[PDB]
Design a protein around this ligand. Structure first.
Ligand SMILES: *[C@@H]1O[C@H](CO)[C@@H](O)[C@H](O)[C@H]1NC(C)=O
Ligand SMILES: *[C@@H]1O[C@H](CO)[C@@H](O)[C@H](O)[C@H]1NC(C)=O
Ligand SMILES: *[C@@H]1O[C@H](CO)[C@@H](O)[C@H](O)[C@H]1NC(C)=O
Ligand SMILES: *[C@@H]1O[C@H](CO)[C@@H](O)[C@H](O)[C@H]1NC(C)=O
Ligand SMILES: *[C@@H]1O[C@H](CO)[C@@H](O)[C@H](O)[C@H]1NC(C)=O
Ligand SMILES: *[C@@H]1O[C@H](CO)[C@@H](O)[C@H](O)[C@H]1NC(C)=O
Lengths: 35, 406, 406, 406, 35, 35
């Protein structure tokens, strides 16, 4: 099942349009695909 | 007709250049040209900058209860999906027995809380932190710092000029004529870090930002560190620089919003975005909208706000302001305490020697000179100027026009 | 008389603008206008700044006697109205037995002392402090620092240019071409702080000031800290900027006093005031007047001097100088000792490892580039310039004046 | 003939000034005059500077073998003329047994080595050092640092733009839009200092230099320290300034060499000199020439290179470049770890608490604003300008020349 | 009894014209009334 | 016997034209006489 924007992607499965990105000060999460 | 030809040669040459140059200088005004006028002026009075400083620890553990540890607990990484302490849990000898008496969820009865009041109560307290404060040799006190919420927590802005108070001025350069503060960063009330999250941090100390009062802090982005166990002199040079609206320049002079600021536009751009994408506003953000929750934070607010400022640059275009003040700074540190005054201050504030070296810092902000400098964009060619070069001779040419038709 | 009218129309128009503009440009010279000419020049030679550095501890306890502890003792807060040690007395294991053998007033016989010689003998000694000194790769030594008294104590000024010695120059930017010193701050000879007073301090380290030789230090006000247990690079950019006397500018170009300085005027303003209000001069002040005493200090000198610089700004108006040099600086620190060289230097200077981390600092001052910049106020419109615009055409107009009277 | 005289008076006066001024303005162009045009421009895009950082320890003891300790050993002052450990030898409890098992020359069989590969293998490893790296919120990694050899050792340059990779840009001021790195300086792999030599050092930490990619580092000379156990924000202001070739200016615009740099010319000047005087080139120097040896180093390379840069200034004249970028910086530190996150990071990287405070540093470089400033030398009077003042009236005068001959 | 300028005002009673002011680095003392 | 340029002058005897100079980060060595 896809993972929505804003949700923690740890151990990953993002919903359509998003890439799972590791943030500087905290755990990775799914967010909008970027140029 | 040699001389007869010359007579008309230079006569027809006159009107050649005349209109030639004339339209040239007319064209140069169409480019709406400017010039940057740099000036160093030494006054006897400087208006002292607003000074905001946040502690790096968002809340005191001394001040957190069973209640807040429920909702908030998992946001500070002190808790599991299961409301429990991870195998990654690393914490002090005494904290165990004191953490769990507050951590017992057997027969648990919850009660409401909001992160605005949470920050308010659990956030660090300037009454506590501030051991001494002097501006220009007149003893100040906690009364003089308005509270501003930032992404750090409860924060404090000196020389606010806000709530319609006055803005302080300085009569002289050097130390005695600036602000000198002495803090206990209060490490003992620092929360434990059992893992990485936006509300938890590896560094101990404060962050400062020096702004015009007209400009709100973004201490997250624009601030500069100060460590404990150091006196730190920060010696400033006021540089004030100006821009023009188009056609000349790109700036926007807007009080439409009080006064326009990059940090200013930069902030509501997070406000609009956080609200919209999270259906909530974050505590240090303005507006009438709802506050977020620990669940809201973790799952929307926090991450969304991170993507905003770091990743996606197509959203916020914040136009270049015309009137802008900047303070150039020079920092230096010295050990405090001296090994000689250690025991004096271990007495005076009633902590251990070893404590003093960790928790005590002294911040000195001042101006090196009373001089301050300016960089101004001025209009190079103005309507008056074109009428000053072409116009006068264009009226003169239009004069010899009639005498000719005869 | 249409064309007949035009003939006089533009003819009377000519002299309209002519005198119009002419008096305008004449008026513009009456405003005594100026322009600030900014220039970046890269030479092959920079004259190296004078560098003053004070230790923060005013005197060594190793070097104080029963004698000085009588008079001075209560000024350093080491004593009571009763010549005794307060309940606020906080001091080292060994200091007791060594403090009181020097503190015994039973069968006490006093002898005279003056704070000038006190500072001289008890003040820190650059022979001791300076473990190594290099300018531009040529080993220097204590011979090269003239002694200047400041409110800190015995202090030392490198690259003095004083006592008619030469001023050093630098052929290249970067580290090897600057000054690099290595100090033992000597904490062990630091006096105890049993309470707060002007001659006692919480911080351990030095204070530096980088000035033109032409300018005396006020290290109290204009100085920048350096902490022990750090190498500190300070990398400078020479910015030299100029002003005009009136009508144009506000500056005062005065060698009447050698050369005029803010710190310069700023100092004798404390001299005159301290003398006058205290009927004494303070040791680091110039003049022929008497030195203060511990009693004089506490009860007049010290407090009066504090009110002067911090509080009352109506007394000293110190006019803006025309010729002024300023050095812009960038600082950074690194740990010293490395944990690897600890024992090397615990050997080499014969102290403990733990000692080295507290007492040893290494200061590197240099230029980043050989370029240095200037900001000059130049006269915009000069008598020659007015004669250059109006004058030439005013002589021409006065020429057609005679041919007319005919 | 009063009026008759005036008629020729001002008539002969006209051509007086005409040629007078005309040749004046003609003379002013012969001085090849210029003007420095200062401009502050705020873009939406800044090209991010290259960032080089060296560790202060040249090689890991963990990574040195019996082999290298033979040749190199006496250069690091770990050895005698006799291949033995001096009475000046000061070293750790455990290092003895581990130093000598590697120090046994009984039945010794040597094998070849070169300092280029030595630095390569024994030099510190960015795979190890770098605990985390982020540019503008996108996680980076060791892949992104090209290796540059400097007099320090193996070194690493971020945002290289080299090997034909792209140069990174920044969309916004502040922290999140810069580079943030976190290092373990690895003191445990630091070599012992038993005495002073060019390859051994008292300080622990890194050295950074921020350059245009077009400019190679001289981190020895132009670099700025960063200490362990501190977060250090370094906040930059891009200042880009320009010069003219003669006659106007002194600069040299030369791609003849890619692009001309002071550090650039400054380096091969050490190359040519080191080669020539030592009949060898030093590892971090360019060219096709041979590498030095430990014997070569000690007896020629090292000392010769020291005399070059510190002492003898008549050798290298390195001309002033026209196009030059400089980054102005503001630094600040805060303690890391907070006493709260200590145990978190003692876990996470598997070292002791006490270790973390010594070996861990976090470097944050950013721009405070998107604005950046420029200082340009522009030509004041150009051929077009002279033809614009004198030329037009010189053609007009040459016109009334013919009508006269009649 | 009034306390003269320049004298320590601790635990206070200044002479006419003065206000008792706490100095940064040391004990409070009576000094000239200030705007 | 004279000591050549580039050679360690410790406990000293330079070859003609050189002066023995103590370097910042390391032992003294003979090098070219300087103005
Ligand atoms: C720009 O700065 C000047 C100087 O303070 C101020 O008087 C003026 O109000 C500012 N411009 C505008 C249009 O706000
Ligand atoms: C003195 O400090 C200790 C430790 O913080 C504390 O227990 C005590 O309450 C403090 N003051 C007193 C004597 O009440
Ligand atoms: C101002 O500075 C210049 C440059 O050093 C110097 O030559 C001159 O003497 C100074 N002006 C006066 C009047 O002292
Ligand atoms: C070595 O250091 C100790 C402690 O300062 C001191 O007692 C001794 O005099 C020093 N040098 C020697 C061996 O005399
Ligand atoms: C000087 O700088 C400008 C701006 O980047 C650049 O376009 C130009 O190529 C440089 N000049 C030369 C001749 O290299
Ligand atoms: C944990 O750290 C220690 C000390 O450096 C080391 O012996 C061990 O190999 C590390 N990791 C493990 C558990 O292998």
């Amino acid at each position: 099942d896809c993972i929505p924007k804003w949700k923690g992607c740890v151990n990953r499965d993002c919903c359509e349009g998003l890439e799972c990105w590791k943030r500087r000060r905290s755990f990775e999460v799914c967010v909008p695909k970027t140029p | 007709s040699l001389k007869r030809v010359v007579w008309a040669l230079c006569f027809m040459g006159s009107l050649a250049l005349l209109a030639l140059v004339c339209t040239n200088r007319i064209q140069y005004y169409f480019l709406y040209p400017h010039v940057t006028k740099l000036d160093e002026v030494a006054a006897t009075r400087l208006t002292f900058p607003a000074v905001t400083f946040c502690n790096l620890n968002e809340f005191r553990f001394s001040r957190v209860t069973k209640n807040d540890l429920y909702h908030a607990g998992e946001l500070l990484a002190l808790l599991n999906n299961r409301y429990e302490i991870p195998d990654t849990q690393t914490a002090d000898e005494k904290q165990l027995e004191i953490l769990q008496d507050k951590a017992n969820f057997r027969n648990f009865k919850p009660k409401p809380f909001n992160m605005l009041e949470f920050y308010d109560r659990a956030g660090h307290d300037i009454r506590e932190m501030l051991l001494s404060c002097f501006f220009r040799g007149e003893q100040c006190s906690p009364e003089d710092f308005k509270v501003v919420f930032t992404r750090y927590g409860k924060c404090y802005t000196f020389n606010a000029g806000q709530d319609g108070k006055p803005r302080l001025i300085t009569m002289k350069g050097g130390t005695g004529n600036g602000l000198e503060i002495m803090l206990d960063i209060q490490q003992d009330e620092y929360l434990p870090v059992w893992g990485e999250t936006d509300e938890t941090s590896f560094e101990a100390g404060i962050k400062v930002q020096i702004h015009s009062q007209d400009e709100p802090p973004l201490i997250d982005q624009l601030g500069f560190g100060v460590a404990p166990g150091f006196q730190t002199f920060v010696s400033c040079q006021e540089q004030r620089l100006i821009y023009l609206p188009p056609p000349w320049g790109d700036c926007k002079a807007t009080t439409g919003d009080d006064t326009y600021s990059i940090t200013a536009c930069r902030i509501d751009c997070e406000t609009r975005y956080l609200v919209e994408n999270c259906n909530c506003r974050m505590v240090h953000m303005p507006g009438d909208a709802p506050y977020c929750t620990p669940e809201q934070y973790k799952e929307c607010a926090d991450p969304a706000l991170d993507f905003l400022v770091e990743k996606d640059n197509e959203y916020c275009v914040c136009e270049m302001p015309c009137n802008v003040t900047r303070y150039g700074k020079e920092l230096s540190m010295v050990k405090i305490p001296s090994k000689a005054s250690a025991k004096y201050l271990a007495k005076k504030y009633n902590k251990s020697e070893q404590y003093i070296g960790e928790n005590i810092l002294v911040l000195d902000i001042f101006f090196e000179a009373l001089n301050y400098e300016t960089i101004e964009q001025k209009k190079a060619y103005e309507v008056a100027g074109l009428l000053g070069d072409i116009g006068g001779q264009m009226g003169l040419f239009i004069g010899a026009s009639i005498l000719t038709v005869l």
